[PDB]
């Protein structure tokens, strides 16, 4: 009977106060919250942020909401949450979170007998992580979504994962292109500000970077690069000329290698692990030639000498580049 | 008489309950859908979404609305629909849609004698579609738009598709560039989560990106620019500047081609066929390009032996190219 | 007499319904619209679609609004405007569009003795024009805006051009940076949809585009360049290594100049008539830079065939040149 | 007394008809304009468009608000904006305005006692600057913001800037990284449309833009350039591989100034003093290339007229070349 | 008792005027300004503005809102803001700010037994911060936050910091990986204009560039390329083509990387002290490469005086470029 039902809602809406929280003035209103992970959309470096879309969901308990003599629960449009009193729950670290709202406002009221009170939402967030990228692109974020109330405290109201370690949901679905989810952890807590205690909840991603794009795309141009210059220790013994082409060539096409890549590595101003690896490249060229140099300086005086030095360098570059490849690889793994 | 259709009007509003769905409590209301789908925007790899705007219309039938006297459809203002009681339908997997409200809201409201309602609107809607880009650019995607009620459960509404196979409309005339709608789907079924069961329409849209310029234009130099690091090695020593010169044009072109087409391509992480191929055909004419080196170097201690290496790589280096890249076409292809 | 104006307004405003249209019921309200273009704010090739503001403006006649006894046309607050019905009118082909709120909104009633409505809107619209960049930048576009009612069919609504040919005016005084406007049309019909019958008006530009910064910035570089390779035929053949300087070096410069333009063009799927020229400019650098390595390879064995085959390039590769350029600018012009 | 103030500020407000202008039926009324630049955010000549924000103030006289016994200036919440009659101003020339909102609504009303409405905002506007960039980065700019009434006429409203030339502050506090306000200058008249005439206010400043980084980044590389191409004048002939590695690579490094310069710079699609700056560097180190051919060419037959077309070339490329410079920067000074 | 509060609320906001500011007519208000800084998320240098979030509360005393018999602080729901009066407190300085809305406004209202008000939101703000980068990238920046009352004069409202010195907290938990905050500063103040004295707070950060990226990407690349120059100098005057070869490489290599830089670098239109280094960098190889020419030119003649110019240059360049390099980082540190 629609009419009856109308008579119920008129019923608990009347003389209901939707500026005060239930039991006010006592206990605190405990809130359960789950999260279904629809998707993860993107990880920025750049702006060192995550964009993460969810159906959050808050279960509560409002004893002026109780109805009796209906055998149902009522969901009702999500206009009736506009006329009701819900968390002040907000996401301690996002720059730019909004309810999705097509064709209708993404949001679920839910009313039941005992007073109790399902309110879910879809909400697309762009929360901010630090990302220590010192060991990048071999590195290793951990980033979190943090939940707070924000008026009131853990004297009028308190934060809990409902359902347990199984809370958050459609984690493993998440198909990231470039990170994978190792591990996901939910947390609970009390934090202390100068109003007061506050409930924490935080959702904690530690996500992994791929590294097969790096290495068959940055290192070994780099790694071909080097090599091409170790060529010209093998080029005659008088080639004044071609040599010097040769190492001309290679320095030239370092540089292009390293401004292109640079350009099309994120804009961050600080050094990283593959800024160390290409510097170190481009000193092992600018070695190589500075050999040339040296070697056809001495070579008209003590041309026995100099070809000598050709010789041990064939060995030296080789070994020392092989060697600052293995510290560079031991130390960033 | 519009004083007549007015005072019919009032009356049917009177005592309305937006809160409360059609049939309330009892059978769901079967809410029948149509897509005319105005264009497709564009299919974006970078971000894996798709821009689609359409003529988005839902039918259904709610007896507190039905009218007698007037043997005429009530087209109203799109104003009356904030009055009554809309299904909350949602697209699941949008990451940003809006309605269209120029010079109005693009919005239709259409009332039956019978109580049949007919609402439209126009949505523009982004659309995420995880892409595999594991055969780029000869790959077939497979991008769907999902619809879903968001509070009600099939106890409480059901989504069928108002036309069978033609419910969706539009579709041959979308103009896409880059591809070309090979097969519209529509699917109709019901989804678990644990609030219950859910109804589910789905229109998924299979494209085949066309070969054309990728064809033309990507794999041709790449093929060129091997051939021409084969008939370096049909060189005698005194033309050998002339092999220099195709040795060096060769490295320095397909690190140019290397970087441009890693710039100006759709920047995913992971890698792709293409990318091999690149790689496999830089590997191989930086081989060549040692095989140089070594045959110059050694050229004076034993010619014989150098002429006998050159010979063999002229046999070997097209056959070694050619099974490769017929293991790399047969593994994508 | 300020008071019995507001009298007058209020009598007109009181029991009116803006749900219904007017003449409800019975002949179609003919709708007069009037468009004052502003400017094109600009024409993206790469999104396809172009900027308009403009004034809109739509003339109608309710008679429920019709009053007497105040000669003067009344000009109401905007604010008004939301007491009124006025027509569902949207663009067909636009993509995002707003109307202007600053200070108020840009929005216009005014009122006539017969009842007359003239409503105004300052509307900035990014309406999609699919273009055909075959041949750019030589091409000549067509970008139409669709004007069409959404909820109101041929028998409730019927669109017209007020003033024939003169009801769009500010063409003249659009100032396109790279276009040109050649003529624009105005059309009036009407469109069957399975809903019926609706009107619609078509305001098309035919938009021109000015070659001369193409014409300076990349057609005569690459001309030049290519003519620069052609130093190398009068350069003595006994100096391998400037020829061989002369043609690696424009080989990397045309590379280079490929590489930026094409990254400073869209990424349409098919060729465009710069991408041929500059492709064919390469061609002619790459097939001199061969015709080197042919000739120092063949120098030896029969020098008086390599120097007639110099003698023979120095003509072939102007004629060749002069024959394809004359063949390009005709083909596309 | 809080309570009269109340009663003196309803009895205000009771009756009143926001729909009507003040004394609607009579004299037009006169409104005053302040403006006080806080900023001027950034100019683009991508875009062609400049971002402006100001305090924007306006002063009329509504004898309905006159009230009596209180000797005060009442400053009245921002609220109570959208409960009195404003005027429709508009800016003729935006993009995209809007005013600030945080905390609250950036919005001032002030009445006076005698009835006089002081109306402030604070409006951050993209207004639409068509600039003349054939002295590009010489060139000197005309930025114009226009201010006009919307709906009502001369008839109903005028126009008047509040206190003369000195309407307009904060112009002297600008900092423009780029430009220097050289002037600025107040214009009010009436402008003739087809439904009447109307008011119109326009705020110009005349914009010089610096060229001092354009002097160090831009042309200093192409001079020295140039200058370093004749280097290969006073190189022996015979040297071949020296001088035809530096005309062609100074040919190379002037096309990789060119189009960096030409990405760094805005994209125009016309013709700029730079460009053509550029293209005559261009021309001279590609005429000092052609030369050295021509020498190369005649030198073994003739050495002394390769000698003196050598000393001719000596003498006549830097003289050429300063005769270009003085009249290019005569021309564009 | 829920309901004896609802009581209580009602009668505190039973004639309740928004529009009046507490003790109307009378002594100042007084408000007290704290501000819980989250995250400074950018600092850009080419629009010259940072982002800022920030919890900003605001203190003052309301009689009108001053209720007894109950001894608790109400924490209302944030709604409850729209019903009462708050200052017009607004950010001078801003560009774009706005209150985060998920998963509802950030908002917080505390009423306390005496009347006191505590009203809490969550900003995000992008500030205006001129900037002198004539230091860059070595500069020291300061970023301000102005706060004002838009519309109230000192005569009407009054602020001061909360707390002292300690009225802004999280200064030193702000992550800036490209800055790092030097120190912040509080003052309050009174500026005035046309209509009167308005109250001011500033809260100022002192921001300290650090230059290890820079140095090792930026200066090193241009010391090493200065370095090979020199290299150049070492090959015997004879070898036309290595030395020529080697001093234009030099030059190009600095022209591409100089390019590269200012295309990643920011693109701000004044001079910086970056381009003054790299500037003096493609003076010294220019120099390098005229020497090598004047030495080239007069070898045969003086082949004495050549030997003394190099090996007189050999010292003199590594020592001209110590000289400049002691002098250019004694001046900017
Ligand atoms: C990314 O980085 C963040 C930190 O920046 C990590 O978050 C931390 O996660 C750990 C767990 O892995 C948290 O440690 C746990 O804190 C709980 C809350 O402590 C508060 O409340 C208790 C009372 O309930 C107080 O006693 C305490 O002082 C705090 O006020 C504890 O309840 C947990 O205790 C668990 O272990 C102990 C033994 O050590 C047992 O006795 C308990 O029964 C229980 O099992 C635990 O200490 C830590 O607080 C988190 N920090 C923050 C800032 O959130 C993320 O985990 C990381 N990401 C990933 C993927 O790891
Ligand atoms: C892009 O990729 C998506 C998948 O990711 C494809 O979507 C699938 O489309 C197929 C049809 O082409 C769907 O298969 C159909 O499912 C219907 C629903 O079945 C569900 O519900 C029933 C109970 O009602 C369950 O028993 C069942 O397990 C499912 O949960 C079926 O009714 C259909 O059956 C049809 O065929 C059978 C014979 O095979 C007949 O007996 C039936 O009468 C009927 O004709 C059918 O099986 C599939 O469910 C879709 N997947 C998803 C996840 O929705 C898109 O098609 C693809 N894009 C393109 C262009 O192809
Ligand atoms: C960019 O491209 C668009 C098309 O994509 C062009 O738009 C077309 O413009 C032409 C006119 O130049 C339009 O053709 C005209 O259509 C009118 C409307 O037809 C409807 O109404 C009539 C009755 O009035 C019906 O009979 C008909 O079935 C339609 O329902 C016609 O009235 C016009 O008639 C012309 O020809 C007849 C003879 O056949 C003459 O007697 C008339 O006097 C008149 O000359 C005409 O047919 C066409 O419809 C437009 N296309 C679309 C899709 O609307 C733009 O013009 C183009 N841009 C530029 C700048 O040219
Ligand atoms: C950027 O470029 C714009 C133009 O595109 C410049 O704007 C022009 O500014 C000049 C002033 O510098 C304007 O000229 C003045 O117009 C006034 C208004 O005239 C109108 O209204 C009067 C009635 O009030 C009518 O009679 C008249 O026909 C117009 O309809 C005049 O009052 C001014 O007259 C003054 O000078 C004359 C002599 O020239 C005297 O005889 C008068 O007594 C009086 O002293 C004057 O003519 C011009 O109108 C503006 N253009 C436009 C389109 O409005 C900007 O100045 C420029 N930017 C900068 C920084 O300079
Ligand atoms: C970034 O740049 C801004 C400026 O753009 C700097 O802001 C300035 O900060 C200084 C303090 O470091 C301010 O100077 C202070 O002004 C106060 C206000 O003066 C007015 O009001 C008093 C009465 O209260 C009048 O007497 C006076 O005439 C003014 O009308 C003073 O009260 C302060 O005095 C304090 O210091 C002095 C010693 O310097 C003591 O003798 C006093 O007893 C007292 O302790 C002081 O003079 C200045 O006004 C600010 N400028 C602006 C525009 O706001 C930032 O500091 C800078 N960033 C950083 C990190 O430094
Ligand atoms: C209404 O809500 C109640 C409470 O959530 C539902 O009761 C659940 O019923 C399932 C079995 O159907 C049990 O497994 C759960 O444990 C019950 N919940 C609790 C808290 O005991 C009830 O099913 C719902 N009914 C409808 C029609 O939605
Ligand atoms: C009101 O709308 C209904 C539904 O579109 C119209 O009924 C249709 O009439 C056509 C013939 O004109 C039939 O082919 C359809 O099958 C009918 N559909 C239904 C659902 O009945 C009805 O004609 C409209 N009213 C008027 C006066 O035209
Ligand atoms: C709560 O206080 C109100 C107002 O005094 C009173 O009417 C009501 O009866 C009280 N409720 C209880 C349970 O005492
Ligand atoms: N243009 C009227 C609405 C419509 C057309 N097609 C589908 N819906």
Redesign the interface.
């Known amino acids: 009977?629609?009419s009856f039902?109308?008579e119920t809602?008129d019923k608990l809406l009347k003389?209901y106060?939707?500026?005060?929280?239930p039991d006010?003035?006592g206990p605190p209103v405990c809130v359960g919250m789950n999260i279904?992970i629809?998707?993860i959309?993107?990880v920025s470096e750049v702006?060192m942020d995550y964009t993460l879309?969810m159906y959050?969901q808050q279960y509560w308990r409002d004893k002026?909401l109780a109805y009796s003599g209906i055998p149902?629960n009522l969901?009702?449009?999500?206009?009736?949450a506009d006329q009701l009193?819900?968390?002040?729950?907000?996401?301690?670290?996002?720059?730019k979170?909004?309810?999705?709202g097509?064709?209708?406002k993404?949001?679920?009221?839910?009313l039941h007998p005992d007073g109790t009170v399902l309110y879910?939402?879809?909400?697309?967030?762009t929360a901010?992580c630090?990302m220590d990228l010192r060991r990048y692109p071999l590195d290793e974020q951990n980033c979190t979504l943090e939940i707070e109330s924000?008026?009131?405290?853990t004297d009028?109201i308190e934060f809990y994962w409902r359902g347990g370690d199984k809370a958050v949901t459609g984690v493993e679905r998440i198909?990231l292109?470039?990170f994978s989810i190792v591990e996901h952890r939910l947390v609970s807590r009390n934090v202390v500000?100068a109003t007061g205690a506050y409930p924490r909840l935080s959702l904690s991603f530690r996500l992994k970077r791929?590294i097969?794009?790096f290495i068959?795309?940055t290192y070994?141009?780099s790694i071909?690069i080097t090599?091409?210059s170790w060529?010209s220790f093998?080029?005659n013994y008088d080639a004044?000329?071609?040599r010097?082409?040769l190492g001309?060539?290679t320095?030239?096409?370092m540089?292009?290698?390293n401004?292109?890549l640079?350009?099309?590595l994120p804009?961050?101003?600080?050094?990283k692990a593959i800024?160390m690896y290409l510097?170190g490249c481009?000193?092992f060229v600018?070695l190589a030639?500075?050999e040339y140099?040296?070697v056809?300086?001495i070579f008209?005086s003590q041309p026995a000498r100099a070809a000598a030095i050709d010789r041990w360098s064939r060995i030296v570059f080789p070994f020392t580049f092989s060697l600052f490849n293995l510290v560079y690889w031991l130390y960033y793994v």
Chains 1, 2, 3, 4, 5 share one sequence.
Request: overall charge neutral.
């Open positions: 009977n629609m039902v109308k809602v003389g106060d939707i500026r005060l929280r006010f003035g279904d629809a998707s959309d993107m702006n879309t959050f002026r149902l969901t009702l449009d999500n206009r009736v009193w819900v968390p002040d729950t907000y996401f301690l670290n996002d720059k979170s909004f309810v999705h097509v064709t209708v993404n949001r679920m009221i839910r879910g939402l879809r909400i697309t967030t901010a630090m924000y008026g009131y405290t009028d198909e292109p470039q500000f791929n097969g794009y068959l795309q070994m141009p071909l090599i091409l060529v093998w080029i004044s000329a071609a010097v082409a001309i060539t320095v030239l096409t540089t292009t290698i401004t292109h640079r350009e099309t804009k961050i101003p600080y050094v800024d510097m481009f000193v600018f030639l500075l140099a040296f056809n300086y008209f």
